[PDB]
Structure formats: structure tokens, C-alpha cells
């Protein structure tokens, strides 16, 4: 009873190669299977949508990773764009071995795949973050293929008006991978936010946009920033932490402003309605561009009583702080707003987005929690208490309490022990001393009577750096040793970039080398078969920052405090031949009224590369199919397949 | 309290700071792993944020950490002009002197006598100022912009010889045109009657003749099945005699084609699709060997031919010809054989009835001749496609002659009235499908409407095999007859409900027709047009005649157009949207110069010293 197993990412992007995995199971060791895999749309009489690729996997080396090309022209010919009920293409494996030997109803076995024209990465850069009407806008767009190397495909750049009305469209075919173009904002344009969108010509939903703001502004001379003492304010009964904030005004070039700061306070609700205080205005001279302004507990509550808001009503309100610094004897003023400063009942805020659901009986359930300080960077050395209550059906629910401190990166890995035949699990995790930030969740156990489970265990539990080799321990749970190998594969950016097998042993350790192909994260789906049914268990593994391999290092001749008109020497260091695209920006523009959105950096680039990832959740699954679905895979072993995804997102 | 009698550095000696770009170093360049490019710092005192992107063929994208370049001058002059200045209005300039040196400076600040500006003294009058170390000293300058377009005013601050420090800044203040700014929003509508409209040319009196006249157009597009389980279960391998094989093949072909057209093959595993194709191939061969010498397709070779089953087989094989590499000439012969059986008046005989009448659908009854005539014509029409474009020309023309004769005969029978629901339903579909004459087609359509039934929402014509089949034929007729209008949607909804019952579509004649109708309905509903709304504007302005276009096939569009007088519109396309042309011009606007809500009045009393007076 052999099986031929077909693996492929659940979504196929037209115009880029598709990674497919074919692997045998339970072969008599004396027969070699040959065949071909291709995409075909049954809606048009099984017309192939891609050239056939053959695998010819044998018993000695069953696993075989092969790539399928999906040119745009082939898709058009087979009629994939004429479909009416959503995008759906079939990937099939044609092999006479199926019908003749296994005695199957037909010599074909395939999986249903969704398809999308989204491909490549487009990065748009604008001259300035904010413009004013009548000024010329200079924007350039970089075209990149899937592998992050520069591409030379035709793109169309359309600029949209503040109301969403297109005011430009230029279909430009570009061999340099950089396309510089400019236009002029109408002199009558009302203040608003524009948008520059770019997409590949052949692709239809492969767009990418960058927003720039149009606003009538005059370039400010100095910058004012209001920094509260703590980004949070405790509102627990009895204790109300004092509210002290610091105000700093500094000329753009660096020297400290010398003026007067006029401050007004108020409250904001969720929508944004303001309820200004009266008589609480504080005005103070700026000494060395500093003014420590605080509200005494006595006067704050008096204002609350005057507004009859009450302490209890401070649920999610924000304490407004607006300054109107007026440099003297300059005469100009600039204003800062401090919308982001909340009233909270606890300083810390647990995040349980990395703790995988779907526990596996018999193995230590690993709990992952990120202790991030309220509206701030992750904090360290914060004891976190978890009380897991395993609900054994045949006895009283046992309660386990285990305590651990944050490692130092804000992440805590607390392994709890779960016995077999457990109905469900309920654990409450609370980090804080005092004022815990309680968070709780319940994970139901898998249905009983199924095949033994697979337990993926990572001894390190830290995000590996590019170039490292993390080790994973695979262990079958509650099943016989009939199987003789562990099959695993690695997914990165919705592509099976590695497939292999590991022999079963007492301690099965698999060394996974994390190169740049695996970033900013990758999955790890490993499966073993208990005779006839499949068993699998995935594991999402993050990766560290992994700075670009390009290694562009902008540098200047130290810090000599250049005068206006002096000739600076900009040193450009690069690891290979490259097209350095430079832009010098006046930081006063950032001070000028705006959202202060971040510019292009690795946060956006890695988000771009990981935008193609198909898997959702921290991994794990109730059944083999669910874990394959969660990891973003399409699976079919003949008698058990994976349903096509309902949407391009989970 | 003393002056300086020209003991200040020369005015021309100090450099002038005039280049103030908010963004300067904009360039894409190639680097051979190392490059130093010299730059010329613009004359603005800020902290430049230099950043770059590396796009190499091998490595890929590699963003770089910004370099915070800081340019700063110890003693400088900050001139901040207002965003908007109105001509012939008092203007206050406050160029502040920033002295970050560790010394006390006495400096002379004066605005160069640029033409178009009237200074307080009418020229370059100096204003001595004492700037203590690490302090700012504003030097107010009241000017009235009398120019027309713009004036470049430079403020020169030349210090004393005690510490010779000076700086000068040159800026251009933009004097906007006299009069306020007005907006004229002219909303409109668009449609496929009411096509052409003309927007009246502007004739307001407040408009200033000499000035700007900008017009913008803003067009907005303003755009507004049966279970795959049961149908899949209909795929069965044909077996039995020449009749029972078609019992199992006709549903199989319909189910395969229904899913093919409804695009429901994704739900089922891909093995089923090829399993369906293989079954069709096997069935095609299985029935092909029941064919007689003259394409009769009888139940048994010994038994005489039946025209009913020959037409049914011809219809089935003709549809399956697309996905099966069949032989057209065999179908051509079968069509030729059918033409022989035609009677004098255009009917069809069927000398030998089929062994089992259960597959005949709603045919058994008082009326049979009209049903067969219409049924054969539907089969005959389906056989037109299989006919090869090259050769066999006479065979086709004979078919169009006979089918027309059958179409004519159906006309008298349908027009005669008192026809059953089944006979009327098939007749209406046959005439509509075969492009029957309008008069006969028109009567047949309304005759069927008369026999129609309506018991509630999504109810028309559990249910008997006759009603289900008759409804399917009517739905096919309605869909092909001037599209679908509030009745195919309502009618087909009943068919889906009737087909969703366990073991629905009891017979095969209903199953093949019903699945044919629903598939036709589904493809009709889930389809969209271009919805283009391209509009062209033309006007004969001062510059002459100009034209524009705005294709809205997909979004919304805005476009600059140089039309200064009455304009014309030419809307086209079925899509309906919104067009609104907005025109902006300067009007003769006046208001208080004085404050309206918050007022401040200040007066000075005493004796003030002077140096130069009128």
C-alpha cells in the first residue's frame, strides 16, 4: 500500500517559479516511480497552465523537491484570467505508476491551489515626507523580483488625488530597475494626503504604494517635543501615580531654545473628543530648553471633580498635553501634542501571540509570552507567574504553578508538563509585582483515539541569528515505531526551500542552517506516518534582524560642524557593484506638521518579504491536515487531501 | 547710546545665503565597492538626514543607516517670511540675529533697497542693534509690497570691527494676486437618453479679468448554485444496453459540463475531474459501437431505429465532442439520417418507440408529435457546431432548410394554443434557440407566459418529473430571450431548491436539461461588462479648439484642461457616474483689516531718540 505525496504552497503566484514537493511512502524498495507535475485548470478542459516537470523519485531517495515555472503567457493561453468564481488552479501529478501498480481509479493525483498575480516587490520613495501646494514632487520606484534581486519588468505608476482621484498614469518599461519621475502639485490643492501607487504591468494586484502629505506649511525653525516621565499612569483604586512630564525645545541645528512654554491639559475619549481643563494651565520659562511640569494629585482630582468625570471613569481616556512654546525675543511659536499617554490599570501588557495552541498530550507544552511595558519597548527582569490547570477527565482538575523571570529580551519560555488523556487546559499568566497584568487562555486537547502525535521541541528558545544552526528534537508520542524516518520541510516566504528526512533514533536531532533565505521567519513542518494515517506538527521560527548582505555604509568626515557651503566628503562603502540611490532630507520637515511616519528601512523591507508568507499562527494543529493548512501548505496523499484556501489571507 | 560712522565690515565682503532647498542630494549613482563624492552644502542651517538605498544585482536591496549631517553657523540671521502676503498691505519682517559666539556684538541691520518694495526710510537705512553673547535680537522691518509678481529682499547684518562677524540672507517673497480665491463646483450626472450636456461658461462679474483661471474636471465611475456534492455523485460509469448506457451517460456528461461551466471542479479533488473525463471517454466508445450503418443509434442492432434516441445521442455526442477527440463525419451522417425521417409537414416519425419510456421525460401523453419535432430540432441545432467548416457544404444547408421547416411547423402548433406545458416549453426554447421568425418567436414567448404559474416568492411551475423538466426548458428560453429580468432569477431559484433534495432530479431527461439550464443561468448572472464611461470635453476658447478624454473602464479621474469658455460634453458607455467641473478664479473680495473677535490696542508716550529724520 504505497502512497505518492504531493506538497506545494497553497497559493501560486503567476510569473514566479512554484516549489513542489513529491515524496514516496511505503515503497517495496524495488520499483522506481516516474511522472510529471503541471498546473491545469479543469474549467477549460484540463488545458495545462505550465510546462510539465518530471521528478522520477526512487525508493533509495524518495523525497524530491522540484520547481514549476508559471509564465504569464501560459496562464493567459489556458484561460486562468477568464474564470468567474474566484481564482482556482489545480496542480496535478501524472504518473502511470498510480494506475498500473496501486490500482487507482485514474493515473492522476493533485491538489487545488489558489492563484494570484501578485509578485515581486515595489518600493516607492518620495522627495520629501510632506509637500505644500505648488511644489514639485520627485518620486522614484524600485522594482524587485521574488528573490530580492533587481528586476526589469514593465511597471505602471499612478498618482492618486486626496479624494482618491487619479491624476497621473505612466506605463514605463525600465531596464535599470529604478524609475525616477516627477510632477507638480496643483497650486489650488487643498491640504490632504496623496498616494503614489505602482504595480507590474502584467500583474494586476501586485501594487505597492507610498503616501505623501500635501499641506500649507512654512518650514519650522525649532522643534518641540513633550516627553512624559512614564508613558503610563496607574489608575488602580487608592494609588494614583503622580503625573509629571518634561518639555524640551531645541533649535533644529542643535542649540537649546530660550522661550516660554504655555501648556494646557485635557482628556481624550476613544474617538478623540477633548474635554479641556480650566485653571490648570501651566506656563513656565524654558531653562536650557527644559521645563519640568507636573500635576499635583490634589489639583488633578479637583479638576476631575470640577468636570465631575470621577476617578473610576478613567478607563481608556488619554490626558492631552499641548504646548505653545514662543521663543523670546524671536516671536515665533511651535506646538507639540501628546495624544499618546493613557490611563492604565497595570504597567505591563502581556502578549500571547507566540504561544501555540493545540497542545499535544505527553510532551511539555511550551508557553511563550512577551512582557512589553505599556506603550514602550520590551522590559526585562519582570517575574511572570503562570498557573496551569490540567483538566483530567477521570479525576479532580490538577493545578500546577510555575514561576519564571523574563530572560532579558522581553520573552519568557515556561514549559509546563501535561499528562496524557487530558480533556483541556486552562492557564492564567500574570506578569507584575505589584499590579499584575493578568491574561488567560484555554487550549482544548486533540480528540482521543487518533494516531500518536509528534512533539517538536526546541532546546534553545531564542531567535537565532543568520548563520546559526538551531537544533530541533523530534519525538513520536503514544505510537508504535513502525515508521523508520522523520520527514521535515522548511517554508520561507510561501515557498518550500528545503525538504529532507531524518532517521528515527532515541534522540532525533535535526540541524537547520538559517541562511538569508530564511528571514524574517520560517516554518518547520515535520511529519511521520503511523502506517496509514499522517501525523505532523509545525513550528514557526523567527529570525534576528539579519542586516542586509549588501552592506551599504553611508559615512562622512566625522563631526566637524560643517558651515554652510562647505564641501563635505560623503564616503560610500558597498560590498559589490550597486546603484546607490541617495536622498538628503531637512529634519525640519519632520518637525513640520505631519504624522511623522517612518521612512523606508529594514522594518518595511522585511515586512515586504514576509508579506508573501502563507502560514498563520504559531504553528501546531489538531490533525495532520490542519497543521499543513496552518503552515500554508497544500497536501494530498491520495486518500486524504487539503481543501483549497477560502482567501489569500488567514 | 552711540552710533558708528562707517566702522563696519564691507557689505559685499560677507557671503549671501540664498539657496534654501528642503531637499538637495537627489541622485542615483553607481559605486564600485567604494566611492567618495564631494557635495556642496546648501546655505540652510539645519540637520540634514542623508540616507541611501543599495540596489545591486547580486546582493539585492540593502538600506543604509542615515547620516545626521549638521550644518550650523555661529552668528547668522534667520529671516522667516510669511506663507501668504497681500500686495499693498502693511507687512512686518522680523529677521532675528542669533549670536552664539562668546562675545558681545553691535551690528547694523538693513534691507537692501530692492525695487518693488518701499522700505521705512525709502532705502538702505541702518538699524544699530546690540546682540549680547548667546542671545537673539529681533530687528523689525515694516515693508509694503508694491510689486506685481515677486521681490527678492536681502537682509544684511554687518557687524562692527570689535569682532568682525556678519551674515546676509536673500529670500523671495511671493505676492499673491489681488483678490481672494473662489471655487465654482458644478456637479452633474451621467448616463448611457440625456447623453450630451453643456456646462455654461462662467459669466460672474466679481471675477478679476487679469489673473488666473484654472479649471479641473473630476469624473467618478461610481460602480455599484447547486451543491457540488449531489452533481458529482451523478458521475457513474455507463453500462447495459444501447439505451441504459445513455441513461448513465447523459447525466454524467451534464454533471461534468455543469461543473465545468460553474467552475465547481475545485471543491472536488482533481482525481474526480479526470475520472469524469475517463468515464465520458468510455461512454463515448460504448455508445459508438451501438451505432448502425447509417448512424441510427438503436437500443439493439436487430431492433429498428428510433429517431428519438438518435437525436438524444446526437445531442449528447455533439456536446462531448469538445472534450473528446471524436470523428465529426459520423455525426454528420447521423444528422443526414435524421433529415430522412422528417415527414411532409416538418414533423418527425419515430417509427419504433424506445423500450423504456421512463427516460423520455414529460413526453408520454396525449401530445407527442410536437414534442419530438421540437426535441429533434434542438438536437439538430446542437449538431451544427460539429459540422466541419471545410467540406460537406450541402449537408448543412439541408439541415437549415429542414430545421426552418420544423421551426415553421412549430409556429402553427404553438400559435394554435391549447398546448400542454411541456410541449409549449420545448417549443418556446426550440424557436428561440434556432433563431425562429420574430412573429412566431414573439407569440411562443407570450403563450408560455400565460401557462406560467406563480404561488409565491421564488416559486414557478417533490415536484413531478414533468414540472421539473418543463421549468428547465422555460428557464432556458427566458435566459436566451432578452436576457434575464426578475424571472430567471426567481425561476432558477426554485430549480436549485428542487435539486437540493436528497436524490433530486429523479429522471435523466430532467437531470440533463435541468443541469443545462442552471449552468446557463449561473454563467449569465456571474458576468460583468466593461462599464466604460469615457467622456470627451471640447470647447472653443481663446487659444482655439481643444479636446480631452477620460476613460473610466475600471476608479475616478481628474484632469487639467485649458478651456476658458463654455464647454461641451460627450458621454458614452452604459456605465453611469458623476462628472463635476470645478473652476477657480480671483474675485474682488474685501473685508476688515482690523480684528473681529479679539482686539489689542497699544500706544506709546514719551520721547524717543533718532539719528536720521525727514
Amino acid at each position, epitope marked *: 500500500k504505497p502512497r505518492l505525496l504531493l506538497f506545494s504552497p497553497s497559493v501560486v503566484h503567476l510569473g514566479v517559479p512554484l516549489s513542489v514537493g513529491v515524496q514516496l511512502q511505503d515503497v517495496p524498495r524495488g520499483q522506481v516511480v516516474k511522472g510529471s507535475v503541471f498546473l491545469r485548470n479543469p474549467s477549460r478542459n484540463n488545458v495545462p497552465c505550465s510546462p510539465k516537470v518530471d521528478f522520477t523519485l526512487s525508493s533509495e531517495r524518495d523525497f524530491a523537491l522540484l520547481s514549476l515555472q508559471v509564465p504569464l503567457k501560459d496562464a493567459k493561453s489556458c484561460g486562468l484570467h477568464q474564470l468567474l468564481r474566484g481564482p482556482e488552479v489545480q496542480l496535478v501529478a501524472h504518473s502511470p505508476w498510480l494506475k498500473d501498480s496501486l490500482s487507482r481509479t485514474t493515473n492522476i493525483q493533485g491538489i487545488n491551489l489558489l492563484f494570484s498575480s501578485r509578485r515581486g516587490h515595489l518600493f516607492l520613495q518620495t522627495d520629501q515626507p510632506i509637500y505644500n501646494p505648488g511644489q514639485r514632487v520627485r518620486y522614484r520606484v524600485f522594482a524587485l523580483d521574488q528573490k530580492m534581486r533587481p528586476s526589469t519588468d514593465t511597471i505602471t505608476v499612478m498618482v492618486e488625488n486626496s479624494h482618491g482621484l487619479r491624476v497621473r498614469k505612466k506605463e514605463v518599461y525600465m531596464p535599470s530597475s529604478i524609475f525616477q519621475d516627477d510632477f507638480v502639485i496643483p497650486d489650488i490643492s487643498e491640504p490632504g494626503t496623496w498616494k503614489i501607487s505602482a504595480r507590474f504591468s502584467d500583474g494586476l494586484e501586485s501594487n505597492s504604494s507610498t503616501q505623501f502629505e500635501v499641506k500649507k506649511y512654512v518650514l519650522p525653525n525649532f522643534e518641540v517635543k513633550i516627553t512624559p516621565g512614564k508613558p503610563y499612569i496607574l489608575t488602580v483604586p487608592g494609588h494614583l501615580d503622580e503625573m509629571q512630564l518634561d518639555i524640551q525645545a531645541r533649535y533644529i541645528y542643535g542649540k537649546p531654545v530660550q522661550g516660554v512654554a504655555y501648556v494646557r491639559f485635557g482628556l481624550l475619549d476613544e474617538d478623540g473628543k477633548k474635554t479641556f481643563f480650566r485653571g490648570l494651565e501651566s506656563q513656565t520659562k524654558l531653562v536650557n530648553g527644559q521645563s519640568h511640569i507636573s500635576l499635583s494629585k490634589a489639583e488633578f482630582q479637583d479638576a476631575l471633580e470640577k468636570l465631575n468625570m470621577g476617578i473610576t471613569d478613567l478607563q481608556g481616556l488619554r490626558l492631552y498635553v499641548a504646548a505653545a512654546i514662543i521663543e523670546s525675543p524671536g516671536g515665533e511659536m511651535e506646538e507639540a501634542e501628546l495624544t499618546s499617554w493613557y490611563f492604565v490599570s497595570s504597567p505591563f501588557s502581556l502578549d500571547l501571540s507566540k504561544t501555540k495552541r493545540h497542545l499535544v498530550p505527553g510532551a511539555p507544552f511550551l508557553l511563550q509570552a512577551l512582557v512589553r511595558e505599556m506603550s514602550g519597548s520590551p522590559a526585562s527582569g519582570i517575574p511572570v507567574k503562570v498557573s496551569a490547570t490540567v483538566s483530567s477527565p477521570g479525576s479532580v482538575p490538577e493545578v500546577q504553578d510555575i514561576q519564571q523571570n523574563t530572560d532579558g529580551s522581553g520573552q519568557v519560555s515556561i514549559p509546563i508538563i501535561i499528562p496524557q488523556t487530558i480533556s483541556e487546559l486552562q492557564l492564567s499568566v500574570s506578569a507584575g509585582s505589584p499590579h499584575p497584568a493578568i491574561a488567560r487562555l484555554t487550549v482544548a486537547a486533540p480528540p482521543s483515539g487518533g494516531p500518536g502525535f509528534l512533539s517538536i521541541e526546541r532546546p534553545d528558545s531564542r531567535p537565532p541569528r543568520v548563520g546559526d544552526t538551531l537544533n530541533l528534537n523530534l519525538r513520536a508520542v503514544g505510537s508504535g515505531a513502525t515508521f523508520s524516518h522523520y520527514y521535515y520541510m522548511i517554508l520561507s516566504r510561501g515557498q518550500i526551500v528545503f525538504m529532507n528526512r531524518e532517521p528515527k533514533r532515541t534522540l532525533t536531532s535535526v540541524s537547520v542552517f538559517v541562511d538569508h533565505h530564511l528571514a524574517p521567519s520560517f516554518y518547520f513542518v515535520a511529519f511521520y506516518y503511523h502506517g496509514d494515517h499522517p501525523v505532523a506538527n509545525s513550528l514557526r521560527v523567527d529570525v534576528q534582524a539579519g542586516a542586509c548582505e549588501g552592506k551599504l555604509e553611508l559615512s562622512v568626515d566625522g563631526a566637524k560642524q560643517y*558651515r554652510n*557651503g562647505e564641501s563635505v566628503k560623503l564616503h560610500l562603502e558597498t560590498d559589490s557593484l550597486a546603484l546607490v540611490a541617495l536622498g538628503a532630507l531637512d529634519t525640519a520637515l519632520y518637525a513640520a506638521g505631519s504624522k511623522s511616519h517612518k521612512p523606508l528601512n529594514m522594518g518595511k523591507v522585511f515586512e515586504a518579504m514576509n508579506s508573501y508568507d502563507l502560514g498563520c499562527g504559531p504553528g501546531g494543529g489538531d490533525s495532520a491536515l490542519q497543521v499543513f493548512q496552518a503552515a500554508g501548505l497544500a497536501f494530498s496523499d491520495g486518500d486524504q487531501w487539503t481543501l483549497s484556501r477560502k482567501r489569500l489571507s488567514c | 547710546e552711540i552710533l558708528q*560712522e*562707517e*566702522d563696519l*565690515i*564691507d557689505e*559685499d*565682503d*560677507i*557671503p549671501v545665503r540664498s539657496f534654501f532647498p528642503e531637499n538637495w542630494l537627489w541622485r542615483v549613482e553607481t559605486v564600485d565597492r567604494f566611492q567618495i563624492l564631494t557635495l556642496w552644502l546648501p546655505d540652510s542651517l539645519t540637520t540634514w538626514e542623508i540616507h541611501g538605498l543599495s540596489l545591486s544585482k547580486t546582493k539585492g536591496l540593502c538600506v543604509a543607516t542615515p547620516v545626521q549631517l549638521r550644518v550650523f*553657523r*555661529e*552668528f547668522h540671521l534667520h529671516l522667516r517670511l510669511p506663507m501668504s502676503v497681500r500686495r499693498f498691505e502693511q507687512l512686518e519682517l522680523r529677521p532675528v540675529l542669533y549670536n552664539y559666539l562668546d562675545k558681545n556684538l553691535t551690528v547694523s541691520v538693513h534691507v537692501s533697497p530692492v525695487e518693488g518694495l518701499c522700505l521705512a526710510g525709502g532705502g538702505g537705512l541702518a538699524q544699530q542693534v546690540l546682540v549680547p553673547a548667546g542671545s537673539a535680537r529681533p530687528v523689525a522691518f515694516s515693508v509694503v509690497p508694491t510689486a506685481a509678481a515677486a521681490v527678492s529682499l536681502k537682509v544684511v547684518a554687518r557687524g562692527s*570691527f*570689535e*569682532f*568682525p*562677524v*556678519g*551674515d546676509a540672507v536673500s529670500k523671495v517673497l511671493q505676492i499673491e494676486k489681488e483678490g481672494a480665491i473662489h471655487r465654482e463646483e458644478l456637479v452633474y450626472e451621467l448616463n448611457p437618453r440625456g447623453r450630451t450636456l453643456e456646462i455654461p461658461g462662467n459669466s460672474d462679474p466679481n471675477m478679476i479679468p487679469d489673473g488666473d483661471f484654472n479649471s479641473y474636471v473630476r469624473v467618478t465611475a461610481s460602480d455599484p448554485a447547486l451543491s457540488p456534492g449531489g452533481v458529482a455523485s451523478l458521475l457513474r460509469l455507463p453500462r447495459g444496453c444501447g439505451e441504459q448506457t445513455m441513461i448513465y451517460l447523459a447525466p454524467t456528461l451534464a454533471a461534468s459540463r455543469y461543473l465545468d461551466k460553474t467552475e465547481q471542479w475545485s471543491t472536488l479533488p482533481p482525481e474526480t475531474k479526470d475520472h469524469a473525463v475517463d468515464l465520458i471517454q468510455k461512454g463515448y466508445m460504448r455508445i459508438q459501437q451501438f451505432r448502425k450503418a447509417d448512424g441510427s443509434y438503436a437500443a439493439w442492432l436487430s431492433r429498428d431505429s428510433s429517431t428519438w434516441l438518435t437525436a438524444f445521442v446526437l445531442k449528447v455526442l455533439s456536446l462531448a465532442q469538445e472534450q473528446v477527440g471524436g470523428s465529426p463525419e459520423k455525426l454528420q451522417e447521423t444528422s443526414n439520417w435524421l433529415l430522412s425521417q422528417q415527414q411532409a409537414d416538418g414533423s418527425f416519425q419515430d417509427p419504433c418507440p424506445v423500450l423504456d419510456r421512463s427516460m423520455q421525460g414529460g413526453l408520454v401523453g396525449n401530445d407527442e408529435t410536437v414534442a419530438l419535432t421540437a426535441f429533434v430540432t434542438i438536437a439538430l441545432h446542437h449538431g451544427l457546431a460539429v459540422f466541419q467548416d471545410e467540406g460537406a457544404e450541402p449537408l448543412k444547408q439541408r439541415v437549415e432548410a429542414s430545421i426552418s421547416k420544423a421551426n415553421s411547423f412549430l409556429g402553427e402548433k404553438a400559435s394554435a394554443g391549447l398546448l400542454g406545458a411541456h410541449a409549449a416549453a420545448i417549443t418556446a426554447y426550440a424557436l428561440s434557440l434556432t433563431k425562429a421568425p420574430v412573429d412566431l418567436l414573439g407569440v411562443a414567448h407570450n403563450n408560455l407566459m400565460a401557462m406560467a404559474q406563480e404561488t409565491g416568492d421564488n416559486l414557478y411551475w417533490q415536484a413531478p418529473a414533468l414540472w421539473i423538466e418543463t421549468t428547465a426548458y422555460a428557464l432556458l428560453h427566458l435566459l436566451l430571450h432578452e436576457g434575464k429580468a426578475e424571472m430567471a432569477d426567481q425561476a432558477s431559484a426554485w430549480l436549485t431548491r428542487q435539486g437540493s433534495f436528497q436524490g433530486g432530479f429523479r429522471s435523466t431527461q430532467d437531470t440533463v436539461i435541468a443541469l443545462d439550464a442552471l449552468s446557463a443561468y449561473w454563467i449569465a448572472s456571474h458576468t460583468t461588462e466593461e462599464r466604460g464611461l469615457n467622456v470627451t470635453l471640447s470647447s472653443t476658447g481663446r487659444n482655439g479648439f481643444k479636446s480631452h478624454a477620460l476613460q473610466l473602464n475600471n476608479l475616478e479621474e481628474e484632469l487639467q484642461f485649458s478651456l476658458g469658455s463654455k464647454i461641451n460634453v460627450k458621454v458614452g458607455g452604459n456605465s453611469k457616474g458623476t462628472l463635476k467641473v470645478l473652476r477657480t478664479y480671483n474675485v474682488l473680495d474685501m473685508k476688515n483689516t482690523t480684528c473681529q473677535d479679539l482686539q489689542i490696542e497699544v500706544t506709546v508716550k514719551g520721547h524717543v531718540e533718532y539719528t536720521m529724520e525727514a
Partner: nanobody
Amino acid sequence: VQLVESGGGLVQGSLRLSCAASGSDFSANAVGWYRQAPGKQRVVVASISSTGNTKYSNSVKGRFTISRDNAKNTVYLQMNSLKPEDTAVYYCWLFRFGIENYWGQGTQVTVS
């Protein structure tokens, strides 16, 4: 940039009292001389602008001329009709970019 000046000495009088500049784009930048008499603060005695527009301190204006030539990157303060209160130590003043000031060692002159 280094400023070098010389030529000061006792006289009954006229002194060439020339000064040279260590390059660094001597032309296109203002230059002049400073008088530093004993006790009182350093003051301007005569200066020449880049364009050639000469300026003299009103106290001793019009007596001794100032000449700047770009041939050898030097300046002169030729003296004449020396007054007994003129005894002071003079300095060679350079003024480049409009904010940078430089002064040399300074030579002292005596009168009889």
C-alpha cells in the same frame, strides 16, 4: 591659515609694514590691520575690502594708506607723518567666509 607680518621698528616717519598670508585663498576675502596701543583695547586702524573699497578708522583717517595686492598674497599699511601717540603693536587681520577671524603674532612699533 598662518598670518606672518613684519617691518615694524623704531622711526623718527614711514614704515612699509607689510604682511603676508599663508595662502588659503588670500584673494576674495577681506583683510586689514588692527591697532593695539598699550592699555586700551585692540581697535581697527585700517582695512581693505575684497572689492577694494577701503575703510579707515576716523581717528587717523586719511593719513596713511592701505594697499593690498594679490600678486604675492600680502598687504601693506604704509605709514606717513607718524604721530607720537601711534606707538602700538599692530596685528595682521584676515577675514574669510565672513565669520572666521585670524590674527598674527603682532609686531610692535616705537616713535620718537
